[PDB]
Every structure is written in structure tokens, then in C-alpha cells.
Amino acid sequence: PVPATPAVPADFAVCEGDNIVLSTTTVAAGYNWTGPNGFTSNLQNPSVVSASLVDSGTYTLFIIDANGCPSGDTSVQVSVHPNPVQPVLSSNSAICDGDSLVLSTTATATTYRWVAPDGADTLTTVNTLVILPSNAFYQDGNWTLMTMDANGCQSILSNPESVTIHSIPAAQAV
Amino acid sequence: PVPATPAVPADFAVCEGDNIVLSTTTVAAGYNWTGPNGFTSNLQNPSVVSASLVDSGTYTLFIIDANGCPSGDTSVQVSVHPNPVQPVLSSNSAICDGDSLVLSTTATATTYRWVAPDGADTLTTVNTLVILPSNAFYQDGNWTLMTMDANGCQSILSNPESVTIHSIPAAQAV
Numbered sequence: 001p002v003p004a005t006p007a008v009p010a011d012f013a014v015c016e017g018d019n020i021v022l023s024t025t026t027v028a029a030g031y032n033w034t035g036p037n038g039f040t041s042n043l044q045n046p047s048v049v050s051a052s053l054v055d056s057g058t059y060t061l062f063i064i065d066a067n068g069c070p071s072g073d074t075s076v077q078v079s080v081h082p083n084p085v086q087p088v089l090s091s092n093s094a095i096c097d098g099d100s101l102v103l104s105t106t107a108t109a110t111t112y113r114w115v116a117p118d119g120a121d122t123l124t125t126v127n128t129l130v131i132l133p134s135n136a137f138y139q140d141g142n143w144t145l146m147t148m149d150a151n152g153c154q155s156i157l158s159n160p161e162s163v164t165i166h167s168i169p170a171a172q173a174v
Numbered sequence: 175p176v177p178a179t180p181a182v183p184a185d186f187a188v189c190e191g192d193n194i195v196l197s198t199t200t201v202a203a204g205y206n207w208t209g210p211n212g213f214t215s216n217l218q219n220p221s222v223v224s225a226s227l228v229d230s231g232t233y234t235l236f237i238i239d240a241n242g243c244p245s246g247d248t249s250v251q252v253s254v255h256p257n258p259v260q261p262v263l264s265s266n267s268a269i270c271d272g273d274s275l276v277l278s279t280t281a282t283a284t285t286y287r288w289v290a291p292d293g294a295d296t297l298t299t300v301n302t303l304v305i306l307p308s309n310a311f312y313q314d315g316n317w318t319l320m321t322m323d324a325n326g327c328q329s330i331l332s333n334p335e336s337v338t339i340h341s342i343p344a345a346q347a348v
Contacts, residue, residue: 019228021228023210042214043208043212043214044208045208045209045210045211045212045213045231046212047211048211048212048228089228117262117263117264118262118280119261119262119279119280119281120280
């Protein structure tokens, strides 16, 4: 009697640079996997494929019975999403202490993480962040920016921008 | 008579970057190991697997008798814990000698090791360390920070922060 069709994971989607992990849960005399970039395996748990864009596509599996009979044909789709472009960060540096600190980009994103010199990490939905003097983020030194896209994929952390805030000199004796 | 099921290690858990070491203690005509990232071996003592997150999962073993008969099926679970993020260290540098030295982070951790320029290593449960002038840790130069998580895994030692303590000038002759 033809053995039952093996189980595979549900249609999935990964970010470029992410891991494509395929496996089955069933028991067989041997397994037979094929795929988009030559992916080939005879294991229950094939080696992990790096999520390159070339690896998009259909991954297919037909198991072997103890007596040599093949199973039916099942498959899973894998869609790899391109990694978003490096944001460019700039700022209104050479700020006199007490004025506003403005950090901005030209990048398009669902959300922007602005990362403070001290590690504090704040998130917004716009390309412009304004930090007032009383704020915990009114910091100088090197600021960085990372952006996320619609599908949840993130860009490479961008080159830092150097923020310098100047002190206000004291009144002098006359 | 079906040979006895071989022994395997107890369910284990390792940190990302750690070693997954699998072995059996029994004697066989050959061994047969399978696993999550394609791990395959026919030895009593398989090669050590680096603890990548892709290697989580079930590791399985069925031994072969001298006469060719297979053993029963036994297994061990391996759970790989992600490595905690690099702490960011900052300080109230340009301290006049005699004032307080404050080292701090934004990292979340079970415990924080603050490492002095001279190698002294002190541990706390908070993200802020205050060192007074009489203390053995009232040191200048490059300080570093490492953090541990709930599962005992440690982060990469962070970029150093430079502490400078200024001397107090002597009173002058007038």
C-alpha cells in the first residue's frame, strides 16, 4: 500500500540573509528533497540553506517505505525578501546646549530605530526625530540608525553620525 | 534477540557559540546518529557540533548488533540559547580626583561584570556601579563590561570606555 505523503512546514517567507530551515516529522527508510538552487537532501533534517534570493521557490519531498515504495508528492513554498538599503543618517550638529537636536534620514521604512550613543533605542514611524534638552536622548557622540521594512526585514546598521553639542560659556568677571 | 536500546546524554541546553557534544557509552558493530542540521554520524563519539541556533532540535540514535539487527530508538534534546547583545558602557569621565566615579549601561542582565583597567573584576545585579575614592576600583584608563543572562549565557565583551580622573593642582606660592 503506497505509504502516506510526508508532512512539510507551512508556506513560509524569510528575509535575505535569514535561514531557510526545512525538515519533516515523519519516519522513512530514506527521504528525498529537491529545490530551487540545487538543494538536494536525503535526510529527515536537511542542512540549513542561507536565504539568498536565488533560493526562492518550491521545495519538494517524496519519502521511501521500508519495502522500497515511494510516497506521494508534497511541497512547501519559500519566499525570500530582499534586504532593505543602508539608511543615511545626518544631523544638525554643532548645537548650542539648550537648542533642539534633530536627527533625520531619507530612507523609507515602516519604522525607524534611532540608537543613542549610550545604547538607548527609540522607535518611530517617521524619518525625523527631534530630541529636546530635557529628554533622555539628548546625547552627543556617535548616533546610528537602523530601518525596518513592511515585511519585517531590517537593513544593515548605518554608518554613524557624530553629534556635537557645545557648552554655554560662563559670564565673565569684568 | 533485538539488542538493547543504547544510552544517550540527558536533555541538555547550550549557549549560542558553545559546543554540542554527543556520544554514547555502549558497544556496537556501528552506530547511527541523525539530527537537526543534517548531523550524521556512524561513530560512538561523533564530531562536535558548534552550537548554532539552527542546530536546536532532536538528536536520534539506533545501534547495530554484531549480527546486523538494529536496536530500539532513543533520543536527546538540545536547546541552543541566543547569545546576549553587546553592552554599551559609558561613564562620567573628566572626574576631579575625590569625586565619585560612575559607570553605567543600558543593557538588561541577570548580572553585570565590570572590569577594571588592572583586571579587577566586580559583579553586581544592577546596571549602575558607583566607585568611591577609597575603593580598590577607583581606576582610570580603559574599563570594559560583560553581561550575563538568565540562562547563564554571556555577551561579547563590550567596547572599552576611557575614564580620566584629573589631579587637583597644588596651592601656589603668592
